[PDB]
Amino acid sequence: TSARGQLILIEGLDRSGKSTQASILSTKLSPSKLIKFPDRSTPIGKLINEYLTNKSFTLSDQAAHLLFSANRWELSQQIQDLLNQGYFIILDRYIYSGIAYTLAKNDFHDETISQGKNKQQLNNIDWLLSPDKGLPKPDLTLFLTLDLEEISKRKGWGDERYELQQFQAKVKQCFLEILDTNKDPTIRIVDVGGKTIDQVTTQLWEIIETNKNHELINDSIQFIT
Amino acid sequence: TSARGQLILIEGLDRSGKSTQASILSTKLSPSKLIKFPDRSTPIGKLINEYLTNKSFTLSDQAAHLLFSANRWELSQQIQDLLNQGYFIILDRYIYSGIAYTLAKNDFHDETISQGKNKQQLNNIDWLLSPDKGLPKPDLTLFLTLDLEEISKRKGWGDERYELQQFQAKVKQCFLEILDTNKDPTIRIVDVGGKTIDQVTTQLWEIIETNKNHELINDSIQFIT
Numbered sequence: 001t002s003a004r005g006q007l008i009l010i011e012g013l014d015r016s017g018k019s020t021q022a023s024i025l026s027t028k029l030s031p032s033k034l035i036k037f038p039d040r041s042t043p044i045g046k047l048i049n050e051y052l053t054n055k056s057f058t059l060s061d062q063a064a065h066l067l068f069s070a071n072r073w074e075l076s077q078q079i080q081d082l083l084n085q086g087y088f089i090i091l092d093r094y095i096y097s098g099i100a101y102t103l104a105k106n107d108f109h110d111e112t113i114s115q116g117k118n119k120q121q122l123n124n125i126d127w128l129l130s131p132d133k134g135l136p137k138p139d140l141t142l143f144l145t146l147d148l149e150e151i152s153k154r155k156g157w158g159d160e161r162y163e164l165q166q167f168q169a170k171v172k173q174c175f176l177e178i179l180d181t182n183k184d185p186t187i188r189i190v191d192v193g194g195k196t197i198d199q200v201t202t203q204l205w206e207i208i209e210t211n212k213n214h215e216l217i218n219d220s221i222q223f224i225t
Numbered sequence: 226t227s228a229r230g231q232l233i234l235i236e237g238l239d240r241s242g243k244s245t246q247a248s249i250l251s252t253k254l255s256p257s258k259l260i261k262f263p264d265r266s267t268p269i270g271k272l273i274n275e276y277l278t279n280k281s282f283t284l285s286d287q288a289a290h291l292l293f294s295a296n297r298w299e300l301s302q303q304i305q306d307l308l309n310q311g312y313f314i315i316l317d318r319y320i321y322s323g324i325a326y327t328l329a330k331n332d333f334h335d336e337t338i339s340q341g342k343n344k345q346q347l348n349n350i351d352w353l354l355s356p357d358k359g360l361p362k363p364d365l366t367l368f369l370t371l372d373l374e375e376i377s378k379r380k381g382w383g384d385e386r387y388e389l390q391q392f393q394a395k396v397k398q399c400f401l402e403i404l405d406t407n408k409d410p411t412i413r414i415v416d417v418g419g420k421t422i423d424q425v426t427t428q429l430w431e432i433i434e435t436n437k438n439h440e441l442i443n444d445s446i447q448f449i450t
């Protein structure tokens with residue numbers, strides 16, 4: 001069919017290096033757009049931002065999970081169009097963040113993070129995934145993994161709802177549980193413990209340059225199933 | 226286990242008689258609560274209300290569909306609790322409205338009603354249903370069916386986004402396609418053409434009184450799957 005750019009997703013915990021490497025990679029990729037999730041500029045995004053930033057605000061975990069997926073569906077069409085025009089697209093967070101942050105509440109009791117004692121559907125990975133099905137699949141997913149101790153040493157803690165170490169630990173496990181690189185070879189878990197900014201960039205670039213994710217291709221856009 | 230009230234859902238098109246019969250039935254049922262979907266009082270509800278009432282407002286069909294389901298998940302816990310305390314609950318619209326109004330956009334081209342030429346997932350009944358899975362199943366679902374010509378004669382057209390006869394026709398078909406009373410005997414399609422307010426009430430009541438949906442039961446709450 002025709003030429004297109006590629007979709008490259010960076011996942012990870014807070015302060016794992018995602019926005020830093022996303023910008024650096026927008027620079028190496030050309031032409032390139034950078035999209036952040038959640039997109040707090042959209043109308044659903046502003047709700048999500050209330051939820052994350054005003055910790056008195058009330059919303060069931062299932063409602064919240066659905067808002068995050070709806071927010072991606074606000075951008076889906078635009079993403080496809082840009083890719084098909086030959087743009088390279090860097091995502092900072094996406095469907096893996098969606099599943100993992102919600103999945104982690106399932107055995108976690110903290111009235112701020114997870115409202116109420118019932119955890120209905122919060123361990124059902126298929127329910128959690130189903131609203132993101134049909135969204136564009138990244139051509140490459142890069143998961144940046146790191147020690148909680150190393151994260152605690154960096155600037156960037158912002159007092160949002162999920163920014164609690166005991167919860168972040170559960171989220172770390174949930175991410176490694178849903179990221180299976182044998183069942184899906186588009187996924188690359190990259191250990192960034194004790195690596196500088198440039199060393200990370202060099203590793204990230206090598207993975208990209210080797211699979212040729214920086215070059216146009218004649219494949220169609222894959223979709224999440 | 227313990228006693229509970231019952232969940233009785235009234236579905237139908239606009240002006241098919243739903244709010245009228247819901248109030249009348251809150252009166253016959255005791256103790257009773259009436260819940261309307263969408264619930265436009267919640268924070269997601271206010272978004273839904275923007276979407277329905279400000280026809281210049283922009284939102285992808287998939288995002289919109291997800292908001293409607295999220296809105297039900299705002300109320301899910303409360304619904305269960307009230308039922309388990311012995312309250313009878315009347316719903317005016319629910320998951321059937323969710324699927325049908327979105328499913329109907331799939332072969333309908335009108336930039337107000339359905340933004341953009343792609344209809345991704347809008348014919349996939351499983352995607353459409355999946356976010357409502359795990360919500361409480363009504364014990365009885367009553368679908369009020371009626372001619373479009375009879376509807377056009379009644380007061381109640383409010384200029385909201387979907388209030389176009391050519392779309393309403395597609396929605397009517399979608400409802401009859403997803404409501405299968407053989408595969409699910411909790412569902413009752415009731416023809417209300419040429420029936421007065423009281424004649425409808427008498428028919429609705431007979432169905433309820435006969436299945437004993439007005440009485441407490443020792444069954445657990447069923448859930449959508």
Ligand SMILES: Nc1ncnc2c1ncn2[C@@H]1O[C@H](COP(=O)(O)OP(=O)(O)O)[C@@H](O)[C@H]1O
Pocket residue numbers: 012013014015016017018019020021154155156195196197198200
């Ligand atoms: N390899 C690294 N070593 C040390 N600090 C880093 C590294 N990468 C990023 N940082 C710094 O740590 C902080 C968090 O990085 P950031 O890229 O904002 O993470 P995220 O975008 O995942 O929340 C920033 O202050 C950033 O400069």
Ligand SMILES: Nc1ncnc2c1ncn2[C@@H]1O[C@H](COP(=O)(O)OP(=O)(O)O)[C@@H](O)[C@H]1O
Pocket residue numbers: 237238239240241242243244245246379380381420421422423425
């Ligand atoms: N059986 C009926 N015959 C004639 N008019 C009716 C009947 N039931 C309701 N109405 C009237 O038609 C209008 C629409 O009814 P309503 O119950 O508001 O429908 P919905 O709640 O489904 O939008 C109201 O003005 C109402 O009084």
Ligand SMILES: Cc1cn([C@H]2C[C@H](O)[C@@H](COP(=O)(O)O)O2)c(=O)[nH]c1=O
Pocket residue numbers: 014037038052068069093094095097098099101102160162163
């Ligand atoms: C994209 C996304 C983020 N999140 C969480 C991760 C962060 O705590 C929060 C905001 O992310 P940010 O700090 O990277 O903007 O949202 C979800 O719970 N679900 C999602 O789908």
Ligand SMILES: Cc1cn([C@H]2C[C@H](O)[C@@H](COP(=O)(O)O)O2)c(=O)[nH]c1=O
Pocket residue numbers: 239262263277293294318319320322323324326327385387388
């Ligand atoms: C409950 C619900 C309503 N709808 C539509 C039907 C109506 O056009 C509109 C508002 O309903 P109302 O007029 O009964 O308040 O919302 C959906 O599209 N999805 C849903 O899930």
Ligand SMILES: [Mg+2]
Pocket residue numbers: 014015156
């Ligand atoms: Mg961050």
Ligand SMILES: [Mg+2]
Pocket residue numbers: 014015156157158163
């Ligand atoms: Mg932070």
Ligand SMILES: [Mg+2]
Pocket residue numbers: 239240381
């Ligand atoms: Mg009405």
Ligand SMILES: [Mg+2]
Pocket residue numbers: 239240381382383388
């Ligand atoms: Mg109306």
